[PDB]
Design a protein around this ligand. Sequence first.
Ligand SMILES: *[C@@H]1O[C@H](CO)[C@@H](O[C@@H]2O[C@H](CO)[C@@H](O[C@@H]3O[C@H](CO)[C@@H](O)[C@H](O)[C@@H]3O)[C@H](O)[C@H]2NC(C)=O)[C@H](O)[C@H]1NC(C)=O
Ligand SMILES: *[C@@H]1O[C@H](CO)[C@@H](O)[C@H](O)[C@H]1NC(C)=O
Lengths: 187, 430, 137
Amino acid sequence: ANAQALNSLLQQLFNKFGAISSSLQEILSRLDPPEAQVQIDRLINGRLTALNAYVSQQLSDITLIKAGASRAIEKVNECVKSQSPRINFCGNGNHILSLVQNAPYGLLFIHFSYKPTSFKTVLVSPGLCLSGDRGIAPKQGYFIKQNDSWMFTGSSYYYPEPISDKNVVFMNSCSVNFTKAPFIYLN
Amino acid sequence: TNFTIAGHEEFIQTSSPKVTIDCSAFVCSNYAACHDLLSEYGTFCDNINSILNEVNDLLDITQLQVANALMQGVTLSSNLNTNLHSDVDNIDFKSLLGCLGSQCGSSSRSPLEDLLFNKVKLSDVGFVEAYNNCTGGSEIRDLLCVQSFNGIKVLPPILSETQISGYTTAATVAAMFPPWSAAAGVPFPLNVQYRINGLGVTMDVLNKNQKLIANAFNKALLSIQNGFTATPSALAKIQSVVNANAQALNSLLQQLFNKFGAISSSLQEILSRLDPPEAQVQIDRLINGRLTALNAYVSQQLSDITLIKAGASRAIEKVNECVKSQSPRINFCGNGNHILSLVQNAPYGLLFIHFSYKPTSFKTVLVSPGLCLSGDRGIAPKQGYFIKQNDSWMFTGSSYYYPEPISDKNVVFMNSCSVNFTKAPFIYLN
Amino acid sequence: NLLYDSNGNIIGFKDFLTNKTYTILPCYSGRVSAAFYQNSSSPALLYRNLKCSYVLNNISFISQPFYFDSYLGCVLNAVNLTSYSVSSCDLRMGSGFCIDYALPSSPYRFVTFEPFNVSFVNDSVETVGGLFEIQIP
Ligand SMILES: *[C@@H]1O[C@H](CO)[C@@H](O[C@@H]2O[C@H](CO)[C@@H](O[C@@H]3O[C@H](CO)[C@@H](O)[C@H](O)[C@@H]3O)[C@H](O)[C@H]2NC(C)=O)[C@H](O)[C@H]1NC(C)=O
Ligand SMILES: *[C@@H]1O[C@H](CO)[C@@H](O)[C@H](O)[C@H]1NC(C)=O
């Protein structure tokens, strides 16, 4: 696009623009001096208009260029040299880390993500209530029922583990939509 | 002491109507004697067409980006809403959902979007319905038919409004039924409780006022739906954009009736009254005037497309970081206390629905930023304060008054206490 | 003897030798959008906002063996195959439609443009036995 613009800017020097010849040499030594300004002015007006249009196009493009560059700077500072807690910014939700490389007229990014391959269906419970009007809710995971017993699994893997203090939050009440389990004596 | 939930709407412009101008149909004439002189200017009208095409390409690119941001990481079940219960946990979401079942085709707009689309005439379908009437028999006078025959016509986008409405109503049900993609795998009421818990409200009051939260959500949705009968700000901005586009299109057409130092605005009168060898001056004057007008128009378009792109990027960022996921950034998705956010399709942009946490009653109480325990040990509260009740130290939240005993789950420990901390040797672990 | 509008447009005329009133409507002057493949032989014409009942007898006198009306005007040298959708398309027309080329009648096919989809899973929505049912990697 830059080369096409530069080539189109040069081709405007071979235009007549309402004159008798598209050349400043074929006008001077072809008429009397008083009858040359009328054509030189018309030759100058078109070139000035073309230059103004080119300057306007450059001013319109530089704004988007600077906006993209600022976005690139922000993305570098928030994804390469740091791990921001922002989601759906450096990747597609499962972003891990990113690297930066030099590229012609810009920069190159390499985003690493977390892509699962296999899946497995399982019934989950979004919270339980223990004996004594006490309720518990999982933190980044679910509650499964394996061998008439409740366990805890992650939201992105299926490795069962027993319920502990660092894997569940404690509440002093629970609604009627949760599942009752009075045999979980893991306080 | 008491709280409620309030709603708030917001509109962000994303797209703009695509305008196309003809090279020779508008500059000189449908004739040929004028075109024989326009060739002396070289490829001057080709450069005008090398700007609107790029503007339309940028508009298509940003529309595809918005669609991708709406449809990224979204998975639904096969047993979809086939006339099923659109309400979950006493929360009526039917007023902002279309239809995604096997039936109900060729129409996917929600009842909320219909109120917005029925108050604008120059929508995506409006130009299509107003342009095809210029042949089968239109009214006595129509501006769009006159502008179309002179080289000014508005092209429809690459994606219809129905597809955008479908994308929106599919992204809305994401955080409504398992699996919860837009809630990171958390049910809707538990997600709302987690959102409102981060402000300082304890879990003891949330479980006792679930029906209150449901009624507050229903009342907020009803107030947002009924607020479109009057003149709101989003509809005002949409009408302003439409009127500005119409005024620009009408002002661009009036340049064909100016004189521009010539003898007459009509080009046929100059060629049917004066001899050939003197009409070139008038033709050149008219050509220069109309080319200057077209250059001014394309310059204004290039000036507006930058702000359009900026608004579209802002809308994309909001869609990515407010509705599909929660970002720990205050005063970004709303006004202070922010809980959730919803997106709806709007003419030439998107419509957002923000839910906030608005208290009702207040109470004055004495608080302490920290106390010193026995043994030069320190302790400071987190997301709350320290209050005294019946000559005993307890803990309370920063957004709700509910005393609770001090435990290791609500405070932090320090190896040294400051000199401006209230002494309290009576408390050991209570 | 003349009727004008708000901004300098003649939209009427009265004759003085016949005492009859007429109405002036401008003539048709529009372009055509034609999609052309890499090494095809004839593009796919598209007259926007024009029915083929008016094009086949007032615009183009060439015998067109293929024509059918659509949402954006009738398309020439194409087939009505809107029941088939594509993901990526290089000839975009608008309103969710595009034209793709298939190497063989009319090789141009008028299809639907659906660039984004959603992953479907065969699971239940309502709670079964008080528990949900989701997929875990
Ligand atoms: C088109 O319409 C005009 C307007 O009506 C017609 O002009 C009218 O023509 C009639 C018949 O010639 C005139 O009536 C005459 O009036 C004189 C008195 O002035 C009377 O002595 C005659 O016996 C006759 O009744 C009428 O005045 C005249 N109106 C005007 C305003 O000039 C015209 O004839 C119509 N043209 C055609 C082709 O029908
Ligand atoms: C939609 O499906 C098509 C065809 O399977 C595929 O090419 C395209 O990448 C899909 N889009 C998304 C967003 O998954």
